[PDB]
Amino acid sequence: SRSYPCDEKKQNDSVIAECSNRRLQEVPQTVGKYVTELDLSDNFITHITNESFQGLQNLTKINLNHNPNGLNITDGAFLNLKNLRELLLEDNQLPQIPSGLPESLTELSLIQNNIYNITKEGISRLINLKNLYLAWNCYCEKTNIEDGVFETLTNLELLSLSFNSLSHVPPKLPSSLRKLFLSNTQIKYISEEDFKGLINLTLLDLSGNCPRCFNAPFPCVPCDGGASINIDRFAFQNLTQLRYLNLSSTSLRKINAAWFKNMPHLKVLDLEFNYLVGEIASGAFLTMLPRLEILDLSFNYIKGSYPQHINISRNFSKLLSLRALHLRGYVFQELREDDFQPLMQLPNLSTINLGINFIKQIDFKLFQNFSNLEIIYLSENRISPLDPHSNFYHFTRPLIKPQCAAYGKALDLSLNSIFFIGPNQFENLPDIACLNLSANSNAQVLSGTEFSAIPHVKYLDLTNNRLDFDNASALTELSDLEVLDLSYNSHYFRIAGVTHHLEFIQNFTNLKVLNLSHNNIYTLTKYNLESKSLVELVFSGNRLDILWDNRYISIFKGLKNLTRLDLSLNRLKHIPNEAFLNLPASLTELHINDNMLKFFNWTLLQQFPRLELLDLRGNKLLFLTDSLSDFTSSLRTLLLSHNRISHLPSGSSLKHLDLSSNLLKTINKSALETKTTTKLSMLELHGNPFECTCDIGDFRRWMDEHLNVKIPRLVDVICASPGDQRGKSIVSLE
Amino acid sequence: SRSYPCDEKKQNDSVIAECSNRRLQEVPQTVGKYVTELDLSDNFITHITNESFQGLQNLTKINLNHNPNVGLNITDGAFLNLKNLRELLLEDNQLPQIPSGLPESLTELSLIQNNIYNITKEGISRLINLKNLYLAWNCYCEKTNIEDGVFETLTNLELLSLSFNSLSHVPPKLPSSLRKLFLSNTQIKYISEEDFKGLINLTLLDLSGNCPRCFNAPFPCVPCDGGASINIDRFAFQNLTQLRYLNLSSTSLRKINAAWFKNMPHLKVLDLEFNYLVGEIASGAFLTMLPRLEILDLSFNYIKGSYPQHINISRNFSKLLSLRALHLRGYVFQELREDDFQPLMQLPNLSTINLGINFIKQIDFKLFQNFSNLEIIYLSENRISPLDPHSNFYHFTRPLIKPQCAAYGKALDLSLNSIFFIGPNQFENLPDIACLNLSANSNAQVLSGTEFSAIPHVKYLDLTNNRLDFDNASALTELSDLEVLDLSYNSHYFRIAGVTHHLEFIQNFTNLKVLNLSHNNIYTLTKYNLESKSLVELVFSGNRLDILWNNRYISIFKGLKNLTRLDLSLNRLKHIPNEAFLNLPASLTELHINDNMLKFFNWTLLQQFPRLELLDLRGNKLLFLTDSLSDFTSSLRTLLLSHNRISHLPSGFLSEVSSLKHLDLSSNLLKTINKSALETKTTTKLSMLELHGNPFECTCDIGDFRRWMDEHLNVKIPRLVDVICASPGDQRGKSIVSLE
Ligand SMILES: *[C@@H]1O[C@H](CO)[C@@H](O[C@@H]2O[C@H](CO)[C@@H](O[C@@H]3O[C@H](CO[C@H]4O[C@H](CO)[C@@H](O)[C@H](O)[C@@H]4O)[C@@H](O)[C@H](O[C@H]4O[C@H](CO)[C@@H](O)[C@H](O)[C@@H]4O)[C@@H]3O)[C@H](O)[C@H]2NC(C)=O)[C@H](O)[C@H]1NC(C)=O
Ligand SMILES: *[C@@H]1O[C@H](CO)[C@@H](O[C@@H]2O[C@H](CO)[C@@H](O[C@@H]3O[C@H](CO[C@H]4O[C@H](CO)[C@@H](O)[C@H](O)[C@@H]4O)[C@@H](O)[C@H](O[C@H]4O[C@H](CO)[C@@H](O)[C@H](O)[C@@H]4O)[C@@H]3O)[C@H](O)[C@H]2NC(C)=O)[C@H](O)[C@H]1NC(C)=O
Ligand SMILES: *[C@@H]1O[C@H](CO)[C@@H](O[C@@H]2O[C@H](CO)[C@@H](O[C@@H]3O[C@H](CO[C@H]4O[C@H](CO)[C@@H](O)[C@H](O)[C@@H]4O)[C@@H](O)[C@H](O[C@H]4O[C@H](CO)[C@@H](O)[C@H](O)[C@@H]4O)[C@@H]3O)[C@H](O)[C@H]2NC(C)=O)[C@H](O)[C@H]1NC(C)=O
Ligand SMILES: *[C@@H]1O[C@H](CO)[C@@H](O[C@@H]2O[C@H](CO)[C@@H](O[C@@H]3O[C@H](CO[C@H]4O[C@H](CO)[C@@H](O)[C@H](O)[C@@H]4O)[C@@H](O)[C@H](O[C@H]4O[C@H](CO)[C@@H](O)[C@H](O)[C@@H]4O)[C@@H]3O)[C@H](O)[C@H]2NC(C)=O)[C@H](O)[C@H]1NC(C)=O
Ligand SMILES: *[C@@H]1O[C@H](CO)[C@@H](O[C@@H]2O[C@H](CO)[C@@H](O[C@@H]3O[C@H](CO)[C@@H](O)[C@H](O)[C@@H]3O)[C@H](O)[C@H]2NC(C)=O)[C@H](O)[C@H]1NC(C)=O
Ligand SMILES: *[C@@H]1O[C@H](CO)[C@@H](O[C@@H]2O[C@H](CO)[C@@H](O[C@@H]3O[C@H](CO)[C@@H](O)[C@H](O)[C@@H]3O)[C@H](O)[C@H]2NC(C)=O)[C@H](O)[C@H]1NC(C)=O
Ligand SMILES: COc1cc2c(C(=O)N3CCN(C)CC3)n[nH]c2cc1-c1ccncc1
Ligand SMILES: COc1cc2c(C(=O)N3CCN(C)CC3)n[nH]c2cc1-c1ccncc1
Ligand SMILES: *[C@@H]1O[C@H](CO)[C@@H](O)[C@H](O)[C@H]1NC(C)=O
Ligand SMILES: *[C@@H]1O[C@H](CO)[C@@H](O)[C@H](O)[C@H]1NC(C)=O
Ligand SMILES: *[C@@H]1O[C@H](CO)[C@@H](O)[C@H](O)[C@H]1NC(C)=O
Ligand SMILES: *[C@@H]1O[C@H](CO)[C@@H](O)[C@H](O)[C@H]1NC(C)=O
Ligand SMILES: *[C@@H]1O[C@H](CO)[C@@H](O)[C@H](O)[C@H]1NC(C)=O
Ligand SMILES: *[C@@H]1O[C@H](CO)[C@@H](O)[C@H](O)[C@H]1NC(C)=O
Numbered sequence A: 001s002r003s004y005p006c007d008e009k010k011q012n013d014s015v016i017a018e019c020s021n022r023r024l025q026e027v028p029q030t031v032g033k034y035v036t037e038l039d040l041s042d043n044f045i046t047h048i049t050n051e052s053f054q055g056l057q058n059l060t061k062i063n064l065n066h067n068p069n070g071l072n073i074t075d076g077a078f079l080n081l082k083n084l085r086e087l088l089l090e091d092n093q094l095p096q097i098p099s100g101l102p103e104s105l106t107e108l109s110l111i112q113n114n115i116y117n118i119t120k121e122g123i124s125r126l127i128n129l130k131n132l133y134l135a136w137n138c139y140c141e142k143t144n145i146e147d148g149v150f151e152t153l154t155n156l157e158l159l160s161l162s163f164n165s166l167s168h169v170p171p172k173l174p175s176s177l178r179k180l181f182l183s184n185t186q187i188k189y190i191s192e193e194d195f196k197g198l199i200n201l202t203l204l205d206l207s208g209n210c211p212r213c214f215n216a217p218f219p220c221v222p223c224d225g226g227a228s229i230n231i232d233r234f235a236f237q238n239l240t241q242l243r244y245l246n247l248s249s250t251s252l253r254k255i256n257a258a259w260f261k262n263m264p265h266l267k268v269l270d271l272e273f274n275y276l277v278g279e280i281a282s283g284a285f286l287t288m289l290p291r292l293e294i295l296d297l298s299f300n301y302i303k304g305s306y307p308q309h310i311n312i313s314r315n316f317s318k319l320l321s322l323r324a325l326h327l328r329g330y331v332f333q334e335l336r337e338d339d340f341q342p343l344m345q346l347p348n349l350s351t352i353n354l355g356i357n358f359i360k361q362i363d364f365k366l367f368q369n370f371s372n373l374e375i376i377y378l379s380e381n382r383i384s385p386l387d388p389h390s391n392f393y394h395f396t397r398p399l400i401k402p403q404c405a406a407y408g409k410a411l412d413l414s415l416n417s418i419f420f421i422g423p424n425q426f427e428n429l430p431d432i433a434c435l436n437l438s439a440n441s442n443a444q445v446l447s448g449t450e451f452s453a454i455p456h457v458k459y460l461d462l463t464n465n466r467l468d469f470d471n472a473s474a475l476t477e478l479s480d481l482e483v484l485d486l487s488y489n490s491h492y493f494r495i496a497g498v499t500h501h502l503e504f505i506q507n508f509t510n511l512k513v514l515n516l517s518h519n520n521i522y523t524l525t526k527y528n529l530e531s532k533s534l535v536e537l538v539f540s541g542n543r544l545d546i547l548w549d550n551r552y553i554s555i556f557k558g559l560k561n562l563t564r565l566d567l568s569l570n571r572l573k574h575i576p577n578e579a580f581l582n583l584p585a586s587l588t589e590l591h592i593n594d595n596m597l598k599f600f601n602w603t604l605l606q607q608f609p610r611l612e613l614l615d616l617r618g619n620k621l622l623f624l625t626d627s628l629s630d631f632t633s634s635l636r637t638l639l640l641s642h643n644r645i646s647h648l649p650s651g652s653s654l655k656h657l658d659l660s661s662n663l664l665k666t667i668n669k670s671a672l673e674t675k676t677t678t679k680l681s682m683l684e685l686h687g688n689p690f691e692c693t694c695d696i697g698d699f700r701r702w703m704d705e706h707l708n709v710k711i712p713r714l715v716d717v718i719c720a721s722p723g724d725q726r727g728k729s730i731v732s733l734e
Numbered sequence B: 001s002r003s004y005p006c007d008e009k010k011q012n013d014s015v016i017a018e019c020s021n022r023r024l025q026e027v028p029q030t031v032g033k034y035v036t037e038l039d040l041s042d043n044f045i046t047h048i049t050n051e052s053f054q055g056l057q058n059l060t061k062i063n064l065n066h067n068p069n070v071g072l073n074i075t076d077g078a079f080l081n082l083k084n085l086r087e088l089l090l091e092d093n094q095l096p097q098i099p100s101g102l103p104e105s106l107t108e109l110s111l112i113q114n115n116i117y118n119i120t121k122e123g124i125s126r127l128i129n130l131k132n133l134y135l136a137w138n139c140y141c142e143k144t145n146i147e148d149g150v151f152e153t154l155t156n157l158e159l160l161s162l163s164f165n166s167l168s169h170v171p172p173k174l175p176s177s178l179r180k181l182f183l184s185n186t187q188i189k190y191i192s193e194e195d196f197k198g199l200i201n202l203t204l205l206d207l208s209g210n211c212p213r214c215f216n217a218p219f220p221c222v223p224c225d226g227g228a229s230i231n232i233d234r235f236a237f238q239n240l241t242q243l244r245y246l247n248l249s250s251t252s253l254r255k256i257n258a259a260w261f262k263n264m265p266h267l268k269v270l271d272l273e274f275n276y277l278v279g280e281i282a283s284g285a286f287l288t289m290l291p292r293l294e295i296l297d298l299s300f301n302y303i304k305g306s307y308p309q310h311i312n313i314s315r316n317f318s319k320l321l322s323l324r325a326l327h328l329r330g331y332v333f334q335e336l337r338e339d340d341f342q343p344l345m346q347l348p349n350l351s352t353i354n355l356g357i358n359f360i361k362q363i364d365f366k367l368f369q370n371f372s373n374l375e376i377i378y379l380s381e382n383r384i385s386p387l388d389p390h391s392n393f394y395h396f397t398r399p400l401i402k403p404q405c406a407a408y409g410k411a412l413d414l415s416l417n418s419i420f421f422i423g424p425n426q427f428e429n430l431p432d433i434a435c436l437n438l439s440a441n442s443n444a445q446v447l448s449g450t451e452f453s454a455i456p457h458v459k460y461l462d463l464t465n466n467r468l469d470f471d472n473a474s475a476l477t478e479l480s481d482l483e484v485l486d487l488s489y490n491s492h493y494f495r496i497a498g499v500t501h502h503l504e505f506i507q508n509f510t511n512l513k514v515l516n517l518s519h520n521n522i523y524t525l526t527k528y529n530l531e532s533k534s535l536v537e538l539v540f541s542g543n544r545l546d547i548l549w550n551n552r553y554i555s556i557f558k559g560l561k562n563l564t565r566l567d568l569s570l571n572r573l574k575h576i577p578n579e580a581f582l583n584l585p586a587s588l589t590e591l592h593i594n595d596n597m598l599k600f601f602n603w604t605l606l607q608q609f610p611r612l613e614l615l616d617l618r619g620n621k622l623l624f625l626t627d628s629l630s631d632f633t634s635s636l637r638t639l640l641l642s643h644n645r646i647s648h649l650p651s652g653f654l655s656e657v658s659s660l661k662h663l664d665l666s667s668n669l670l671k672t673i674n675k676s677a678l679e680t681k682t683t684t685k686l687s688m689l690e691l692h693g694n695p696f697e698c699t700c701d702i703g704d705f706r707r708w709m710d711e712h713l714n715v716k717i718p719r720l721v722d723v724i725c726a727s728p729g730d731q732r733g734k735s736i737v738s739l740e
């Protein structure tokens, strides 16, 4: 009962069917009637008729996005499915809203289509709609929205008409609306009557109307003569429940304070890509936002201006509930303590985003003066030594990595002019626990005194630099250091009998993660790496081939507590038997992928009784041992994809085996002896040049007898020979 | 008489046989006896015997470098039979000792990158005619065993290079004829007066890499324990009166004794990079001893962990009257004021100032007007804000600024700085700049014809790797004399839907000759016609011509009436429309449509281009070639069609096309060349035909083509070892010329 072409799985007391990206030309009739969620996205389906979803009465969600990669859907093709609640029809080239849609629809998405008319024949009958996404359609000179087409939808909570030539706000909208998205809708004027009966609205998006074109991923055209969006003085007078307001890219050169007169619950205000340098210095509207938590005034700079200081209005002190302030792209030369005086008394202000400001000098003592700062983002400055469902205007990704941020106070000084750690670099700073010094052309010879002013740093990112850590005292001032990242570090001052010297590692009593990736380590001097606390070591992108010379045979034996070792991208052709035996016995994960391994001694796995994962992908291995069970009794996952294995040898802990992208021609009956209690739950085999003759017949019987072994991508398990079966899956054989 | 495997060529009344990189396992005996220079480098030769160069009496030069390429067994006296051998190169051969029985007629001998640990008299002393001796990279053994007086017999030696060898001490008893002594990275920590006693004719002394300051060395680097410097005696250079070149780079020098240059009045080049001379640059007692010095290099002499406000240049820098170039890279300082460079302002010949990689935050650009003859101002890798064993491994030898830029006049390199926008005071108080480099500055300036007004005589402008906006028709129009504009890899930052790209600014130039709009990602344009009467070269590579030509941009380049070179490569072009191709300038002499996805090319359209001499169509998917090319073009001299899918050559392709001298048909799908296409009875002047990388058929089909090669010896076919036939199995791998 192995399903094809859908990889079905149980989810929240209901079986679902993942059938996406399988090159299907039409709706498959081999889908179980018990499924509730069918996903057929990224396929070549061209027609949707009444017989497409025949007998699937329990279908509550259908995803038919990107079909074909136009779509001919007949009238009333989905009406027969009485339980259909969520229907996604994105990127289908539909010229109109499909007719005969079932009234049970609570979620309908018709994004990236050719829908130019919003008719009552396809919308008004859907009285149970809660979410309606009609983005990217007339992006027709204007979208034809029928008068009162949404009035019948008394249950609508979200209406997204973004990226459409609207020009005017649609009249007669349902009072139940809570989220109104109208971004890039060409609406140059907002009146009081546009949001008359929307007293329960909690979100209003009016961004991209009269935009300031700055690195837009979509077409951008200004309002002729630098015109701003004309919002009426009483346009938001009846929006008492408004929490989110997006006025990004609206060429605003003045903010009327009366807009927030009856808006006391406003939590997020977006004002990026405007011309509010003057409004930041005066700020009349700032005294009207006592419950605002996120204020974003990014990329509001004056073109061709590089002022000495940032002019922050005193009225910024009236934003008592503020938690995050994003001031990217303001462009200024110096940040003094006096400049950020209106922000120092805000109790909840934990995030200050000053990225891409080209600040040459910062008085870092002003950060001590803040009451609850947790994130200080200063990336892309000049500090010197000593997808339609996306937010396209706001920096939504975490400014600093959540793993770094979890340790405590975070400071990001990456992409700055810190070419060496100065003696006064970290003086007068708060108790920093997370620090980013990435991409700074830093060639500091770490001698054990550089980070003394911030000694409680636990997560230190020193990637993309030219640092020298040959000294044993390097970074020892950070006693509580737990994660050190030296990814892509290029040694700038190599000594013949010194570089690379990793003696500083054994000084740390709590360092758990160390990333020495892409360091170009081809020489070592002690020659071993000792540490009683180190758990994870990333030695990828180095030269282990050169090291493994009989002096570096026990290079990692000192790391007694090491559980994860990544030896990928090391140009390893053959790991010596003595060198492999000197690896820590405590290892649970070993990644020796993307190398040039021609042979691998499986016999050596007997000295690793805790090894649960062995990654050997992207190699040139040809032979597999016939007695693996004798060497390992704990190996749960074995990845061997993109190798040259052309034969599987004959003959309980192994649950996952990856044999995809290999040279396997067939699987014989002798290797299918599963009379033993082997708990195999996953077996990948896609990309093998199989023989669809009577040789694969014995393997086909094993697949039907052992249904618990999951074989993914059944459409990609293709047999190359013979010509009659070239291209077809191995499961569609006589 | 077509030679194989050597591509022989005549040069100055003597033949020279190029036989390098041909995968030869042994010395070929099919080399003409008339040749004088044989080059068999980069091959798999394993043995050199007396029969290797048999009958080649006229051989004056033999190059056997890199043999084999992943040792070399040379018998004793294997080269003695060649009485005229003057130059012998034996580099990277894993020779354990200097070969014995070498001919006495050797004037040049190179044994670099070998395992030679002993310099014996049995292999060197007999060569009394040696002028150049290169023995670099050998004991790089605890020390090189140099026999006492092994070089004394070599009375004609002018150059001795013992660099990259564990020497520890300067070899005693050196020939008085020596003029160039190279001893770089030789582990010599002490120099005495007796080391250069009888070397009064020495013009070059290299002592670099002895007690080094390890900074980005491409070879092993180890300091002298406890930061020790090279100990040069007070009278070590007392008898070197003819010294012109002195290399003391990477010698950990923290003090320069002025007495070293007491009897050295001809010193022209002094190298002092990678030392600790910050204090010596501020005091400089030795500076008053160099009146004829032209090149002084004090680069990467910085104090680690120090970022001083100013550069301390001694007043004694005014005593370097003959100075032409000063290289002060890696000093590390925050500000350059006019007063700081006061000792250099009165030097008449000072034309080059190298201040690269200094992290200077502010420069008073006015100071450059006080200089009498500044031609090159290199300031790359600073912080200015808006408003191979045969190599010199320590000195920046490449031209700081591209010669084509520098040729215009005063050059200023401000690349890799922090000029994120052109400030209003950016170029004020500068001299009359003709060459300006502003590459890679994250520059998002909206060009409006008012930015370069302070230096309006800029002729070569480099604005590469920036995010500039030149949509205004007035962009760069204040630079009236602009001749070369480089806008490569420019990523627009403020795209307006129906405005970008607006290239109407090009029309306002009366002297612009070269324009490079490569990798600009131009997929939409605004009239949509580019006009110019002076433009000669246009590089439109790395753009989206496929989108533009698929009906508003059909005559995109017709306005460029004087255009001679057009590079339309890397534009993802599958099919150039017939109307779009006909609208190309008729004045075109070179047309490069390479590295595209062209499936078809209309050869008929070449009739409207009577001056087209070069057609580049490499890296394409073309299958068909017209059988009447002579009817369409009468001037096409070079036709490049390599890396295409052409599987058949039509009959009469070579006929009636007398202008064609070069045809590249390599890396194609040609199986064979028939007799019908070899009709060369016409006066066709074909001088070069490339065919390497074709899956040829070594059967009787290729026999008729073989006869054409022997009859027409004037047609040069390069890489004969790479013209390999894939079929049949018996001839798979072998060249087509080694057939029955
Ligand atoms: C102008 O400003 C407003 C206000 O900030 C922006 O509005 C936001 O827009 C984004 C993008 O459309 C919204 O993000 C989406 O939210 C959905 C709902 O999230 C809530 O509910 C789920 C449970 O259903 C919770 O898990 C979640 O934490 C929230 O509580 C999500 O379902 C969406 O997820 C999908 O997209 C993302 C991103 O591609 C994927 O990673 C997911 O896997 C998934 O496919 C998505 O996160 C956001 O909710 C809106 N804000 C509010 C308050 O509703 C405007 O977008 C902005 N305009 C412009 C042009 O920038
Ligand atoms: C230098 O080397 C270090 C050490 O290897 C690297 O740091 C690690 O980077 C990886 C990403 O490559 C991090 O792993 C990821 O962590 C995410 C967050 O984990 C928390 O949240 C999830 C829930 O979302 C919890 O389950 C989890 O327990 C944590 O609390 C995960 O979301 C990621 O999972 C996704 O990707 C993986 C595959 O990468 C899938 O298997 C998952 O199913 C899922 O799709 C992922 O686990 C890791 O946490 C980092 N370690 C540390 C200590 O920070 C550096 O990135 C590396 N530097 C460079 C430049 O290469
Ligand atoms: C310490 O400082 C000294 C002084 O500056 C350096 O000495 C120079 O070293 C370089 C590298 O070995 C020398 O360069 C070579 O010069 C040969 C002679 O050049 C003259 O003669 C030819 C004609 O025969 C002229 O064309 C030329 O302009 C000169 O007048 C060349 O034949 C060499 O060419 C070969 O190598 C180059 C570079 O790889 C290739 O491009 C060529 O095709 C060719 O294969 C080469 O140019 C230089 O001459 C030395 N100076 C002097 C005055 O002799 C030391 O090298 C330096 N030490 C360190 C370690 O940096
Ligand atoms: C943007 O676009 C411009 C215009 O195309 C580029 O600038 C040109 O770059 C080319 C290189 O691609 C330059 O061409 C080279 O010039 C060298 C110097 O030429 C002078 O000196 C030689 C003698 O050495 C004379 O014969 C000649 O007449 C000149 O007086 C030549 O030495 C080069 O020749 C070598 O390479 C070519 C192949 O490239 C071989 O055919 C030769 O045999 C030889 O091996 C070459 O001709 C050209 O001069 C530049 N022009 C200008 C105006 O600067 C930019 O580089 C490009 N920008 C970017 C970022 O790509
Ligand atoms: C320390 O600072 C550096 C530099 O700011 C951080 O690197 C940046 O990390 C982010 C998130 O991983 C990268 O963003 C992603 O980039 C890709 C590629 O362009 C893009 O497709 C994604 O949409 C996303 O924007 C960013 O590229 C990367 N920057 C660089 C220059 O590599 C680093 O993560 C910081 N470390 C910590 C501990 O926070
Ligand atoms: C204007 O300034 C830029 C930046 O300094 C110049 O670009 C640089 O040009 C040099 C010489 O062509 C490049 O050097 C070579 O780089 C390769 C690759 O790393 C290296 O293998 C060679 O040994 C050599 O060093 C250099 O990379 C390049 N820099 C960048 C960032 O692209 C440009 O040439 C200047 N233009 C003029 C008109 O002088
Ligand atoms: C916000 O104003 C800018 C921002 C930028 C950027 C930028 O966005 N960067 C982020 C990505 N990074 C890799 C490079 C730096 N680059 N040049 C700029 C220039 C300006 C600017 C333009 C005109 N007047 C004043 C300032
Ligand atoms: C000359 O002294 C340096 C030079 C450098 C460089 C550098 O050489 N660069 C050229 C290549 N470029 C791509 C990046 C910048 N990077 N960091 C440095 C740091 C220092 C320095 C170290 C210690 N005390 C003072 C100064
Ligand atoms: C739908 O699911 C229910 C159980 O939730 C079951 O009783 C019913 O028979 C199913 N119908 C179909 C057509 O699968
Ligand atoms: C600050 O945040 C807390 C929740 O963490 C919230 O209860 C409090 O009211 C906020 N402060 C102000 C002044 O609103
Ligand atoms: C904090 O800033 C105030 C001014 O805003 C200043 O008076 C005070 O001295 C600063 N805090 C400390 C600890 O110096
Ligand atoms: C390590 O740094 C300390 C402090 O600067 C220094 O005393 C010591 O000599 C350095 N170690 C080495 C091997 O140079
Ligand atoms: C090994 O590392 C883990 C995680 O850091 C730690 O909990 C454990 O105590 C360590 N064991 C030893 C013996 O160091
Ligand atoms: C595997 O390792 C064992 C123990 O070192 C050794 O006896 C055996 O010969 C090795 N096998 C191979 C193929 O190297």
Ligand SMILES: *[C@@H]1O[C@H](CO)[C@@H](O)[C@H](O)[C@H]1NC(C)=O
Pocket: B033, B034, B055, B056, B057, B058
């Ligand atoms: C060497 O060249 C001369 C002419 O320069 C010629 O007379 C002589 O015969 C040639 N010898 C050989 C062996 O080719």
Ligand SMILES: *[C@@H]1O[C@H](CO)[C@@H](O)[C@H](O)[C@H]1NC(C)=O
Pocket: B321, B322, B348, B349
């Ligand atoms: C300056 O250079 C010229 C050659 O261009 C030379 O003749 C003159 O002597 C040099 N000046 C001095 C003061 O040596």
Ligand SMILES: *[C@@H]1O[C@H](CO)[C@@H](O)[C@H](O)[C@H]1NC(C)=O
Pocket: B342, B369, B370
């Ligand atoms: C040149 O510099 C001197 C000081 O060194 C100054 O007095 C003079 O005015 C400067 N020249 C010009 C043209 O201003």
Ligand SMILES: *[C@@H]1O[C@H](CO)[C@@H](O)[C@H](O)[C@H]1NC(C)=O
Pocket: B448, B449, B450, B472, B473, B474
């Ligand atoms: C173009 O440049 C001219 C001259 O400076 C200026 O007057 C004009 O306003 C600029 N165009 C735009 C669109 O700003």
Ligand SMILES: *[C@@H]1O[C@H](CO)[C@@H](O)[C@H](O)[C@H]1NC(C)=O
Pocket: B513, B533, B534, B535, B536, B562
């Ligand atoms: C064409 O360009 C060349 C080189 O710039 C110039 O000499 C010639 O006069 C130009 N001809 C015309 C008609 O502009």
Ligand SMILES: *[C@@H]1O[C@H](CO)[C@@H](O)[C@H](O)[C@H]1NC(C)=O
Pocket: B578, B602, B604, B605
């Ligand atoms: C080539 O161009 C001529 C003139 O436009 C046209 O008649 C002919 O059909 C074209 N050939 C092809 C193959 O397009």
